[PDB]
């Protein structure tokens, strides 16, 4: 108050640090109740009554509207985790908030924040280095069951948990079928190339995998056939309406006898184009642009299927899968226009199929490559959307596991081992960074506590047992195999999780630790706040 | 320990220590790209572009010949008010045939010099690249990059040694630049980025890619690197 006329509000001291810590803690507490296989869901209603049901951290934080920048930092952290990896967007927020909360106590004691920051950096580096000792090479394990177990662990705690084996088989089949042949330095697995469709109706265990492609489109006219056995596919990127001269050109008539032939040529040009296309034996014509009523009749008489308003990405995937070539014009390297039977796709069947009062198109057994699609059935739209969101995580996890052949046990074993190791390692520094390293180690231990709390069990007893076992593993080398005992939440006791089949990619842990440490530092460096009044 | 040598190298790559008296900091360009961590900041001794390629299919070229264009590959258009009048049905087909031939001639002329990479500057009055032209360029296996800004042409020429061309008659094999690699990379989720590296005529330019897990961190790191560059510039200005 008084000097420093700023026309705004400024806060300095422990007030702003406590306020920031409280904001981070509230953001963590919003999503803490959806962690682990025993986590539940959340319902969100907007101001018009639209209902969303989910337990995905990124989706929840994106749908919420927030006013505190310290909370917006965590929101963008979750979004970045979702973009980078695709799994574990709820654990990183909890870890970052716990790191802030534990560092704030040391800051309340007369400890300079720079020492805390350096200790956190050192601890993160050491933890990342140590995690490369708990690795499991997927080739050592049998590949199919390794992938199936990773998928099942990813899909646990979702609406599709009990159907884990069914949906995991579907996911692994789709991912393997969508594999791409690169320069052969590294094969690639481009997920999101698979089309996922939603249609309410029968039970979810009737969701199906299609070896081919599925289009949310219907045939152009009701007089056309709706099933083609041996399909020749032509993909086009232009409209098939009657011609119209450009803006620069205009028609001026001084001899009235010359109007009829111009009016006729206007309609004749497109008919000539269509005859050129059909002369090569094409059975199916896919077009992004529109098709005129006058031009549908040629297909109707020729006995061929025409589909309009096809999305460009769908056309690209169909063309690459069936071996066709996308054309934006019929011109060649000379003046004239030609269509060559060389640029035609081949498919083993094209059908129009009815699904719960609507229709869609199935293209089956493309010969150039292999393609896959998934059709999801559910009770209603909310269930279908949640199933799609839960399936995306499994697809991403399988892609990461296949790209990097390394897995890591789950259930809190990693956090317990890291806490023990960092607690032991903190002594060899013998400085004020020892306190920061110990705080990092202790804040790593929140995941098993949250799992046990959500399972309605004795968190203190379970975590004590885990720490004792991992300590006995880190000493007495002939008992190293005790470093894989995780946590069982359906019974309330430790169990060998690697043997049980609980696996995760290591990239999840590494990236989560790095991003959490960065966010904790960038929020811990703030000293005072100045907020300007709106105009 | 990672950012100091980058700054020193960036300053030493732009000046000539024998007689340099001042440093132009507009010769060093800072590019901010979200994702990753600060640890992923890097120095590029080449050209970096933030926009994507319009050519569907081609994304990597070795031993690239690059050309820069300041004219439009589209239908002919005079600066006076022009218009074509049609009074007979043959002219309707004749116009289309002539336009197609006109575009094809330019495409063949461009192909004649051996060009592999084409850059086109921004144009707002007439379409600078039509679908027919793009189709022909793709058929000739040339990678096309569009909407180059009108204010970084000097930097692009300084970096890769090219020479602007404003008339097709002047498109000749001596007006092109040579590069070892010209390709686009896809970061994990943030997007695409064009990199041109290994220039036969290396100018006195360099660029820096700054990463980070948050926009606040990215801007603060950019300001810190600017501070380091300014300190080195001051030390060049006064050897004390």
């Amino acid at each position: 108050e008084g000097p420093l006329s700023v026309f705004g509000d400024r806060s300095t001291g422990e007030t702003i640090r406590s306020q920031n810590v409280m904001a981070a803690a509230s953001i963590a507490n919003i999503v803490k109740s959806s962690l682990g296989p025993v986590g539940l869901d959340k319902m969100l209603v907007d101001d018009i009554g639209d209902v969303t049901i989910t337990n995905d951290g990124a989706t929840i934080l994106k749908l919420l509207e927030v006013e505190h920048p310290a909370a917006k930092v965590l929101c963008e952290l979750a979004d970045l985790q979702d973009k980078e990896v695709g799994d574990g967007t709820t654990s990183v927020v909890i870890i970052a908030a716990e790191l802030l909360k534990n560092a704030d106590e040391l800051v309340k004691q007369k400890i300079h924040p720079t020492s805390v920051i350096s200790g956190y950096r050192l601890a993160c580096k050491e933890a990342v280095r140590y995690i490369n000792e708990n690795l499991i090479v997927n080739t050592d394990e049998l590949g199919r069951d390794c992938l199936i177990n990773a998928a099942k662990t990813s899909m646990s705690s979702k609406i599709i948990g009990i159907n884990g084996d069914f949906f995991a088989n579907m996911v692994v089949d789709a991912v393997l079928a969508i594999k791409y042949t690169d320069i052969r330095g590294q094969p690639r697995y481009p997920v999101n190339s698979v089309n996922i469709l939603k249609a309410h109706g029968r039970s979810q265990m009737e969701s199906m995998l299609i070896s081919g492609y599925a289009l949310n489109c219907v045939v152009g006219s009701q007089g056309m056939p709706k099933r083609i056995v041996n399909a020749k596919i032509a993909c086009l990127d232009f409209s098939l309406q009657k011609t119209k001269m450009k803006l620069g050109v205009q028609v001026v008539i001084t001899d009235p006898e010359k109007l009829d032939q111009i009016r006729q040529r206007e309609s004749d040009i497109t008919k000539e184009r269509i005859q050129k296309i059909l002369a090569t034996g094409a059975n199916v014509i896919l077009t992004t642009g529109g098709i005129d009523d006058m031009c549908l009749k040629y297909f109707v008489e020729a006995g061929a299927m025409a589909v309009r308003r096809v999305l460009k990405r769908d056309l690209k995937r169909i063309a690459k899968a069936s071996g066709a070539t996308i054309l934006s014009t019929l011109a060649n390297l000379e003046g004239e226009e030609t269509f060559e039977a060389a640029m035609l796709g081949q498919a083993e069947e094209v059908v129009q199929e009815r699904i719960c009062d609507d229709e869609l198109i199935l293209i089956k057994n493309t010969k150039a490559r292999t393609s896959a699609s998934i059709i999801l059935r559910g009770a209603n739209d909310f269930m279908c959307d949640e199933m799609e969101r839960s399936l995306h995580d499994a697809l991403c996890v399988v892609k990461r596991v296949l790209e990097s052949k390394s897995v890591v046990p789950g259930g809190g074993a990693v956090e317990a081992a890291l806490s023990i190791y960092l607690e032991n390692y903190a002594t060899s520094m013998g400085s004020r960074e020892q306190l920061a390293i110990a705080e990092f180690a202790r804040s790593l231990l929140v995941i098993p506590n949250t799992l046990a709390v959500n399972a309605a069990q004795d968190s203190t007893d379970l975590v004590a047992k885990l720490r004792a076992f991992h300590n006995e593993a880190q000493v007495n080398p002939e008992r190293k195999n005790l470093k894989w005992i995780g946590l069982d939440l359906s019974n309330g006791k430790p169990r060998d999780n690697k043997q049980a089949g609980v696996f995760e990619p290591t990239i999840v842990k590494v990236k989560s630790l790095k991003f959490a440490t960065e966010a904790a530092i960038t929020i811990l460096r703030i000293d005072d706040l100045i907020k300007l009044h709106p105009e | 320990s990672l950012l100091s040598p980058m700054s020193v190298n960036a300053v030493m790559k732009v000046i000539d220590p024998a007689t340099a008296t001042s440093v132009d900091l507009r010769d060093i360009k800072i590019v901010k790209k979200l994702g990753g961590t600060i640890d992923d900041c890097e120095l590029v001794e080449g050209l970096v572009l933030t926009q994507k390629v319009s050519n569907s299919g081609i994304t990597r070229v070795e031993k690239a010949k690059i050309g820069l264009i300041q004219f439009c590959l589209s239908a002919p258009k005079t600066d006076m008010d022009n218009q074509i009048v049609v009074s007979d049905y043959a002219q309707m087909d004749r116009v289309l045939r002539e336009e197609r031939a006109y575009i094809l001639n330019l495409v063949k002329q461009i192909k004649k010099t051996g060009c592999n990479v084409l850059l086109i500057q921004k144009s707002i009055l007439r379409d600078a690249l039509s679908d027919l032209a793009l189709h022909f360029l793709n058929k000739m296996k040339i990678m096309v990059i569009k909407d180059i800004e009108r204010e970084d042409i000097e930097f692009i020429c300084k970096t890769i040694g090219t020479k602007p061309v404003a008339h097709i008659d002047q498109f000749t094999a001596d007006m092109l630049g040579s590069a070892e690699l010209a390709e686009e990379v896809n970061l994990n989720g943030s997007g695409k980025l064009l990199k041109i590296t290994g220039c036969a005529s290396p100018g006195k330019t360099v660029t820096i890619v700054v990463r980070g897990s948050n926009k606040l961190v990215i801007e603060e790191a950019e300001r810190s690197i600017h501070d380091a560059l300014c300190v080195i510039r001051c030390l060049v200005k006064k050897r004390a």
Binding site: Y180, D182, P190, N192 | -
Partner: peptide
Amino acid sequence: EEAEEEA
């Protein structure tokens, strides 16, 4: 799309 290879 990530798939931006040969053609």
